[model samples]
Target: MIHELLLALSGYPGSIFTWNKRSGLQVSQDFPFLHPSETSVLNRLCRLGTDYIRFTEFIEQYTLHGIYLRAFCTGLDSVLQPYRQALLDLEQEFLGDPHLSISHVNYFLDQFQLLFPSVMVVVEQIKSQKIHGCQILETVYKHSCGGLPPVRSALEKILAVCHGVMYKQLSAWMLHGLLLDQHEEFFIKQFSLRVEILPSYIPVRVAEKILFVGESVQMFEKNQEDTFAAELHRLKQQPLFSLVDFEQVVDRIRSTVAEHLWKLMVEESDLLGQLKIIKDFYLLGRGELFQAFIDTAQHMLKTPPTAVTEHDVNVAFQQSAHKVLLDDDNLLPLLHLTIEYHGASGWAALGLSYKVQWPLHILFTPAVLEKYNVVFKYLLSVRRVQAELQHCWALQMQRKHQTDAIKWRLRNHMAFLVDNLQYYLQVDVLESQFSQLLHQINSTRDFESIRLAHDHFLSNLLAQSFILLKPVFHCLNEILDLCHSFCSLVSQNLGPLDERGAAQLSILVKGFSRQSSLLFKILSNSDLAQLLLRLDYNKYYTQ
Candidate 1:
């Protein structure tokens, strides 16, 4: 112990230790003799041969002391005991506890410092089982953070304040007023109350990638702007702890979000690259039909048909009906839907009746109607081309006689088709079935050109039809002039039924019959065919 003391004295000589002599002044209420001090060497010399002491025995009665000169340190039990009790007491009274604030773990440096003045330090050597125990008490009794009572009261308070300061200002905007309302009540009833303790609005604020027009970051409700600046400042800066201009920050967030939304809208359509949005679009329904429409358009343009197949034979209507009288039924089944005619009835001089394919009048989006329209038109054109190809092949080098009967029905069908086309073209009230859409959005120049091209095609076909009919018209005129001459002849001399006159009249009747039969052969026109049927019933042919 003396050796240890000697080494300790070397470094801390003036402060904690001193080489006091008899001439030096004595100090201290406890152990004054030790305060005056006597060196081991002096004592040893004084003892001389009188004590005849050994070195180790010198310390047995020697009281060497200075201000803090004791080689032994006393336990601090006395100083800390009652002080710990007082310290523990301070943890109460709103004014007293000084440790009302601690961080999430219930241990903050400020909290630790606030506890310092209350902790009465031991005057000397700081040791005591009680003090150790008190430290353990402080630690074990420390508040659990951000939770229920008897837990981290201090940390929970901080979290409460922070949560109030931050999310409260934005919650109204995020939840559109559910922060504290009947809505919040509904929310709690709907979702977990534990999650309710957190800011319910925070989840939606996630900055996911922008996917489409009208997609936007969550923004503050316009109504909240009135309270935003004041509410945020009151919550956060109530104790003069204001944040950066809260209003300005909110404006920035809102402005940037709006700009981003507009950019997305103007820049492009749905951003399917983000799968979540695609999932949502799918959830909204009807996306597949629109996609089908687009895909069909692409395929049609890219894969033009090399040859028409039997698959193209799917027709909604057939041209087999010899005459299509104006029908009273289903007057408006055009672009509103596909019309698959079943069987027609020549039930009216003014009309016909047909079993309808689209009986239910199904409801769907426009894209569905348009998609079916594209495919329908595409298939129709394909079939028409196929029909033409067959006609060309069957009539190659004009062998139309070998299969003439086979050709007759097709020829009749083709002629009736021209009549139907012309009938549709010549309607007095001719509103196009497709013109509803055309009238709605024909602002594009393409529509104008397409219409012109359609008209031009019809005009060219009609011009060719006229060229084919011109000789027929001339022959009809010649026949009509002959009718006039024949009428005059019939009137000229029926001057009695002389037997000589009878022979000439009979011969003239045969000529009339022959001319009428040949004209019937030339005129395949349906209206004129009615007249030929009349002639076939019975006429004067005495020859």
Candidate 2:
């Protein structure tokens, strides 16, 4: 009985329990209260376990980090056509036109803008933070599959150079300059760049500069319009004769405004916009003020006014033209502010210069005025070509001076260049016949025949003149090439003057002369000769 009792009491209240030694009968406390709240009941249960299968065990999440990274990297290296290509394009631009100008710079910048759009995609990705890491930078992103964040960070860093306040302002300025350009699109450009790298002071610098740019430009324009409008308003204030010293007031504005305006025009990076502004303020539809003066001036000059002084013409001539408006090396000296082929005001603009040739319709017949406008514009284009031709000759002279080519030019180099400018000026014909064209207005229907003949002859003459420009350019190019090559050898203490070299030079100079002769010969054959003054070419020059 004792043994049975002891065996029953061995593991009493729990699965493994020590004997209380005083109990004879025992309860299963391990399962006490239906095994709900008791510690290890004496039922002595064994083999209890659990087996789990979590949601993550069977799921497959596809990530293209590696592939995209590699692709992105490959993309980076491949695109932009190897930016050395962009370098080559600019190189070609200057190489073709060694002379730097605002126009040329603008063109090159546009081409670069074209080429950079490819790389532009990469940077745009960075801005959006949606791009993956590139292959080379892949290690930077994911040392061991680091994940999406690092890849995005890398791309962001790639585009972060220009991702600041300064760049944003600059871009806004550029966009405004470009999209709003209203005239013919040969932009006046500058590479006055401000590139930064993780720079903190960018905000300050850009803010200051951009603000100055904006305010200064607006200030200039405001002053420009206000000052002119003051005059126009003044016109409404009184009749033309009463305005104090009309000639002096008119002269002052012309002198003050033109050079001043042109000087400021070169200072800005937004050259195109400035040109647009100038043209807009001064000479587009209903372009000018001072038409009130027109009526009085026309009344004064009812019989073809000869009151225009040559000095007056020269003043207008100098404004924004050639040496009058020169830029330093950053923008070439030849950066002429040519009037783009847009509309100018038909009104007689008193504030603007008075070119006798510039038809004041009130002062002249409508048909005559229109015809003269055409002629004057043609004169402007011809003047531009003439300057270009002059430059080519000057360049040839400089190149020739380096060698002994002057000795071979019959010692008339100076004479030819200086004295024989009659053709370009249209000489005696210009001063006299232009007078005829302007003064000899066909008043009646009977003179329609005369008008047609006059128009036809002018066209033929001008066309031949325009045609001669090509050959002149061609000859100059050849001459330049010859001088360039010959001097190259001569300067190196090499390729001493030889028979073949002399012969080559002779042939080139002869070609130049032959082509140049065509210029005068064209006029000689045309009806324009009757109007020309046949001068003793010899009396004009001597050895």
Candidate 3:
């Protein structure tokens, strides 16, 4: 019969129990029965329970007095076993329920909340009683076969339900705290995950992608509008003169024709070609009118009529229009013709200066300017190049000065020369033998031979010195062009100066001199000079 009942229990959906005649009420399978639906069903059937005989022995051994026993065992034995039995029945009922679905899971959750407070009070009472001996005994006895399997299984299921409900409440509280704190990012991330689990929810990935693309397009449009607005503002700031004023002046000239005619006649004649025209018109043909007109125009320009409102905006607009007209070929020539006819005398006076003083000044000035400009520009270029080279040189020279090859050559030549000089000095130390050889050569009338021998000795010494210094000479030549370029720039700009320009020129000259002195000092030291000379000429010193 037990086997038949076990078979029937196994057929139930949430069944966690199996039965046998040898091992009564054993768990048939492991179950995570902490889920709310399982807990609600299980708790409904269970009352808290104790193993009566187990607790009776526990109470006797660990309690301070026997009087504590009545208080301890009074409700404990009655409640404990019934609780275990009730839980077992509920577990069986839940398994048997055919209509249990996920909605029933939520219903079970609500029931657990109501029961938890009462359950907590019972647990606290047990703790206060200090009747811990039963648990200890149970733990020890259950160490091997782990006690009556049904009781162990039922304990596990209850503890699991307690933990699940507690954790769910804790999680909900934590989420509430996050929302209250207005932690949008944390809320969004968590909410997004929750939403993702729902089949009907929109995907956050698609929303984020669309939002990002929209923001980028908005930023791009804003930037383009700002750039165009900035460009328009810049255009508005440009200086412009008025076309209306020019037209008004021409109209005034046409209106006062008779009074201006004689003045205009003189102005229309070229002063150089018609010097007689000016004298004849003034002294004989009434050229005083021309002079008076000039005086009047000059006075009018210097102190014209004052008006309350200045037509700046109108002037600016007119200027813009006039610029367009001046740029047009048809209108430009007509305007130029009128100006040439009326202002011929002034042009001739200005033209005389161009022919006389301008050619001579321009001839020399531009050439000087060109030369200096070339030098200044060249120096700027060289400095730019040198800056790059200096960087490269610093990198190369970071560890140590790298002039070994050149220094070795210098040292080898110096050693050879010194050795030869020492040999000559030793030969000279044997003065009597050297003097007798020289006297014999002299006595044979070989002055030319003695002179040739001296020359040959000096030539060999010089050759050694030259060989030692060849790298130094090569480095110097590279540096010389840079110095020459600098000096050429200064010389072209500062011509043979009079006192005023000469004083200013002196400051530049002194600066160059100081730089030259420093450069010369650097070149004089042997080790430092050799290193300086051999410094990669391509980098520091321009060719």
Candidate 4:
């Protein structure tokens, strides 16, 4: 019965102490021949047997699933070998003497009593929940970092092996952009930007950069088979242990990978050319080209939604681009006219959409391009005002005789405001910032830096254009409508001011001044102080 109990404690079946799947190793029936003291000893030892079985079952189950689990299981085999050896020694004592007592058994179990509780704590923590990958390593690290020396040392060794596995998974991703996690147990998984299973040692920012570097390598994988081979090989030689060293090597790989990605974008993908198209079309950089399109498509835009078609709008756009000698087979094909008519007409509902291919499409993601579309629409609205005011100038030129002084002053004031507003947007905002962006992009081969510079340019452009400031944008558009109204009144009349034209001109200029003052007041509180200074250089709005 003693031998049977020892065998059950070692995780084998026994007759007196039986295994219950739910209750674990427990005494099945009391022995009348055994002393009460022996029975008490057996009952106490039963808990140890239960803990061992629980740990063994957990290890056996999880070891088949993840690398960290397998590593921990392997580590445990070596760590607990002495316990198994001690059980064997006690078994030999029972067999050799044939006089082994429960007291002797209790003495032996006393030495190993602390081991089961310490190890069982870890098993309890992990087995109660579904944990995998670096999270498992983190659990081990937490236990190993501060515990009894015996438990700490044992768990620390396990941590070393599991961390090695972690580095192996990380290297596969950072080196080759490969998701090597077959069991979905790596800190990074397939097709996700969000991180899970991160160790406490790794900062979230560092983990984010690590993720970005791997994803960037994958993004450029289609471009080159061995894009980062040399750099990655050098990086592989330095095994990472601490977060500081991990971050050092990671940032190193980040720069190398980013520079190579930039090389691909610049040399093969024609990154600058694509940017030129965005600047030209999306930012309305090619003034004459869009001016031509707006003029030709003017009638198409004003018509009812049923009468308009994207095909016809696109054809009109192509003809306009052709007439302006803006013919680039690469450029024209990518640019398509898109319209969304939810019970409205004119250019407000119209938009131009550009198609970007894979690698380049990464930089020009749908969300990023949608931001561009917003800036595009805002710029187009400003352009519409400028174009209308220019048409007013042209109609004024066609007059054979002079109009009233009041009418000329009204037209000049409207033109002054519109032209300056155009100048501030195109020259001050877009041209200046784009030039700076180009300078930044040219100076660095780092893809991250270039991407940031490009985004900064767009953000600054939107900010300075007042697109981001809703109140200013609304006020500015209202001023644009006032200009449009004045132009509409002028376009209908070839010659001098009738009483109605003169009176409406008086009202329009009053509203323009009022709105312009509000705009100037709004700009005073903003970073667009330079724009406000330019708009009212000589206290024109104040007076």
Candidate 1 wrongly placed segments (more than 4 Å): 1-148, 168-224, 230-543
**lDDT tens per residue, model 1, 413-517:** 433332233233222112332233334323422222333443443343334223236654454344333333333333444334354544454554465446555
> Per-candidate TM vs. native?
0.19, 0.22, 0.15, 0.84
Better of 3 and 4 by TM-score: 4
Residue-wise C-alpha lDDT for candidate 2, range 118-145, written one tens digit per residue: 3334334443563332222322223222
Full ranking by TM-score: 4, 2, 1, 3
Reference-based TM-score, model 3: 0.15
The most accurate candidate by TM-score is 4
Q: Lowest-scoring 10 consecutive residues by lDDT in candidate 2? A: 46-55
**Residue 465 lDDT (model 2):** 40
- Compared with the true structure, what per-residue lDDT tens digits does model 3 show for residues 1-543? 222322332332124443343423333443464353554443331211112223344445544332223333333343345434543554565578765443443343343333333434433454466533223212212321334444344333333232232233223322232222122211123123323222122245433432322222232233523443343333233222123432343233223322332232224432222322222221112223323323233322223323311232223323443443324433222211011122212211110001112212212233332332222222223333333233333433442432322332232232223223322322232233334434543343322233344334334332322323565444433443443333333344423335344455444435543543444455552244233433434322431
Between prediction 2 and prediction 4, the one with superior TM-score is 4
lDDT of 3: 0.32
After superposition on all C-alphas, the RMSD of every candidate to the true structure, in Å, is 30.0, 30.8, 37.6, 4.3
Higher-scoring candidate on lDDT, 1 or 4? 4
